Design an enzyme around this catalytic site. Structure first.
Site, short mmCIF file in Angstrom:
data_model
loop_
_atom_site.label_atom_id
_atom_site.label_comp_id
_atom_site.label_asym_id
_atom_site.label_seq_id
_atom_site.Cartn_x
_atom_site.Cartn_y
_atom_site.Cartn_z
N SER A 20 0.82 -1.22 0.00
CA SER A 20 0.00 0.00 0.00
C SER A 20 0.85 1.26 0.00
CB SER A 20 -0.93 0.03 1.20
OG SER A 20 -1.79 -1.09 1.23
N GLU A 91 4.92 -12.39 8.87
CA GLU A 91 4.82 -13.75 8.42
C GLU A 91 4.82 -13.79 6.90
OE1 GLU A 91 1.54 -17.40 8.75
OE2 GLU A 91 1.17 -15.48 9.76
N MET A 93 3.94 -15.28 3.47
CA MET A 93 2.91 -16.15 2.94
C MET A 93 3.42 -16.69 1.60
SD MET A 93 0.64 -16.23 5.34
CE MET A 93 -0.95 -16.72 4.69
N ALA A 94 3.80 -17.96 1.63
CA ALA A 94 4.56 -18.61 0.57
C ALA A 94 3.88 -18.59 -0.80
CB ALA A 94 4.87 -20.05 0.98
N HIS A 95 2.54 -18.57 -0.82
CA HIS A 95 1.81 -18.58 -2.09
C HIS A 95 1.18 -17.24 -2.45
CE1 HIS A 95 2.54 -22.66 -3.38
NE2 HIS A 95 2.28 -23.09 -2.16
N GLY A 96 1.59 -16.20 -1.73
CA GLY A 96 1.25 -14.83 -2.13
C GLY A 96 -0.20 -14.47 -1.83
N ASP A 146 -11.50 -3.29 3.43
CA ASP A 146 -10.90 -3.63 2.14
C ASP A 146 -10.78 -5.15 1.97
OD1 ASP A 146 -9.83 -3.19 -0.42
OD2 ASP A 146 -7.90 -2.49 0.30
N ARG A 150 -7.31 -10.01 -3.07
CA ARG A 150 -5.95 -9.43 -3.12
C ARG A 150 -5.40 -9.15 -1.71
NH1 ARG A 150 -9.56 -5.75 -4.76
NH2 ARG A 150 -9.93 -4.22 -3.09
N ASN A 151 -6.30 -9.07 -0.73
CA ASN A 151 -5.91 -8.79 0.65
C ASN A 151 -5.96 -10.00 1.57
OD1 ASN A 151 -5.10 -6.14 0.17
ND2 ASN A 151 -7.23 -5.40 0.36
N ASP A 164 -3.19 -7.36 4.93
CA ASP A 164 -3.38 -6.01 4.49
C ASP A 164 -4.46 -5.20 5.21
OD1 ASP A 164 -3.99 -3.60 2.95
OD2 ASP A 164 -2.40 -4.41 1.63
#
EC number: 2.7.10.1
Lengths: 297, 14
Positions: A20, A91, A93-96, A146, A150-151, A164
Site C-alpha cells: 500500500s 509472516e 505467505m509462501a503462495h502470495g 478492504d 488481493r488482501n 493487508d
C-alpha cells in the site's frame, strides 16, 4: 518495544511487490521466532516519496497488527524502528495473495503451477478460514474496509489468512466507521450503504466477503466487468449485484446472495458463516480457529 | 504480494 528487532538481524533477498505504502521484500530474519535461528519473512517498507498521510498510515497499520493473534490473520513478527528506514516484519505467505493465486490456477494461465483449480471442498475451507479471520477482527472491534481476494494471503500449506490492514479502523466505541467524501476506494467490493452513506460496519465487510466468494468461484475475474468505477457506484447503490460465475457451485451461490442483501441488517455474521461450514472442514480447524477457541465469547 | 491499482477508483461516497 517488545516488538523491536535489531536491524542487523534482517537481510533483504528480493522484491515481493509493491504494498500500500511502499515496496514489500522477501527477507531473512535472524532470531525473530523462538525455535528458529533464521526465518524467511516479508518486510514492508515506506516509499521514499510517500506523502505525510501515507507515512502516517503505514505506521498505523503496523500498530494495529500488534493487537492480533489469530491463525487466520497474517502475523506481525517485529518492527525495526531504530534508525531508518522503519521495517515492518511479517509472516511470509509462501503462495502470495489470493487474487494472484486464483489467477494462476486458470487452465490457460502462463504461471499455472501444475495443480488443479480449487475443489468445492477447498473453496469451503478457504471460505471458512477467511470468515474465521474476519470473525476474529470483528470480535476485536475492527472493521476491515478492504476485504478482497488481493488482501487475503495463501500459506505454504494453502491456509488462507487475512492480510493487508491498510484501511482497517477501530470500531470499539460505536460499532461503525464513517468517512464521506472523495477517496481512492475499492468500489467493486463496497456495500451499497458504504457508497451511499460513507458507513462501514462488519455488515459491509460481509458484503465484501460475498465478492471474495465470487472471486474464488470465478478464479478472480474482475467484478462488474464492462462497468466503469462510476457505473458500479450507481449500479450497486440502486440494488445491483454480481451474477453467478459459470459452473458456480450452488452452495456458494446461496451464500453470496445472502451476503448481498441490500439491507445490512439482513446479511449473515462471520460467526454464522463459520458455523454453516463447520462440519465440512479439515480436522485441524477446531484446533486453530478463532470460532472454536475459548476467546470466542 | 501483487498490487492491483485498478481495483481502486477515485469516487465520492456519503
Amino acid at each position: 518495544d517488545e516488538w523491536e528487532v535489531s536491524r542487523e538481524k534482517i537481510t533483504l533477498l528480493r522484491e515481493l511487490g509493491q504494498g500500500s505504502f511502499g515496496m514489500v521484500y522477501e527477507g531473512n530474519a535472524r532470531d525473530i521466532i523462538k525455535g528458529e535461528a533464521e526465518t524467511r519473512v516479508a518486510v514492508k517498507t515506506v516509499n521514499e516519496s510517500a506523502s505525510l498521510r501515507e507515512r502516517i498510515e503505514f505506521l498505523n497499520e503496523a500498530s494495529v497488527m500488534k493487537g492480533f493473534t489469530c491463525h487466520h490473520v497474517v502475523r506481525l513478527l517485529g518492527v525495526v524502528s531504530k534508525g531508518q528506514p522503519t521495517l515492518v516484519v511479517m509472516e511470509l505467505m509462501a503462495h502470495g495473495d489470493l487474487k494472484s493465486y486464483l489467477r494462476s490456477l486458470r487452465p490457460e494461465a502462463e504461471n499455472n503451477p501444475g495443480r488443479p483449480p480449487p475443489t468445492l471442498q477447498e473453496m469451503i475451507q478457504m471460505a471458512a478460514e477467511i470468515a474465521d479471520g474476519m470473525a476474529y477482527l470483528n470480535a476485536k472491534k475492527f472493521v476491515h474496509r478492504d476485504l478482497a481476494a488481493r488482501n487475503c494471503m495463501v500459506a505454504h500449506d494453502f491456509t488462507v489468512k487475512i492480510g493487508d490492514f491498510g484501511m482497517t479502523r477501530d470500531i470499539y466505541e460505536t460499532d461503525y466507521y464513517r468517512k464521506g467524501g472523495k477517496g481512492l476506494l475499492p468500489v467493486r467490493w463496497m456495500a451499497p450503504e458504504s457508497l451511499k452513506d460513507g458507513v462501514f460496519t462488519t455488515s459491509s465487510d460481509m458484503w465484501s466477503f460475498g465478492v471474495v466468494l465470487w472471486e474464488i468461484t470465478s478464479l478472480a475475474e474482475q467484478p462488474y466487468q464492462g462497468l466503469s468505477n462510476e457505473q458500479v457506484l450507481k449500479f450497486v447503490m440502486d440494488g445491483g449485484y454480481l451474477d453467478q460465475p459459470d459452473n458456480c457451485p450452488e452452495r456458494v451461490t446461496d451464500l453470496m446472495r445472502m451476503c448481498w442483501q441490500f439491507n445490512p441488517n439482513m446479511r449473515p455474521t462471520f460467526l454464522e458463516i463459520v458455523n454453516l461450514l463447520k462440519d465440512d472442514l479439515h480436522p485441524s480447524f477446531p484446533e486453530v480457529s478463532f470460532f472454536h477457541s475459548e476467546e470466542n465469547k | 504480494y501483487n498490487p492491483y491499482p485498478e481495483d481502486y477508483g477515485d469516487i465520492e461516497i456519503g
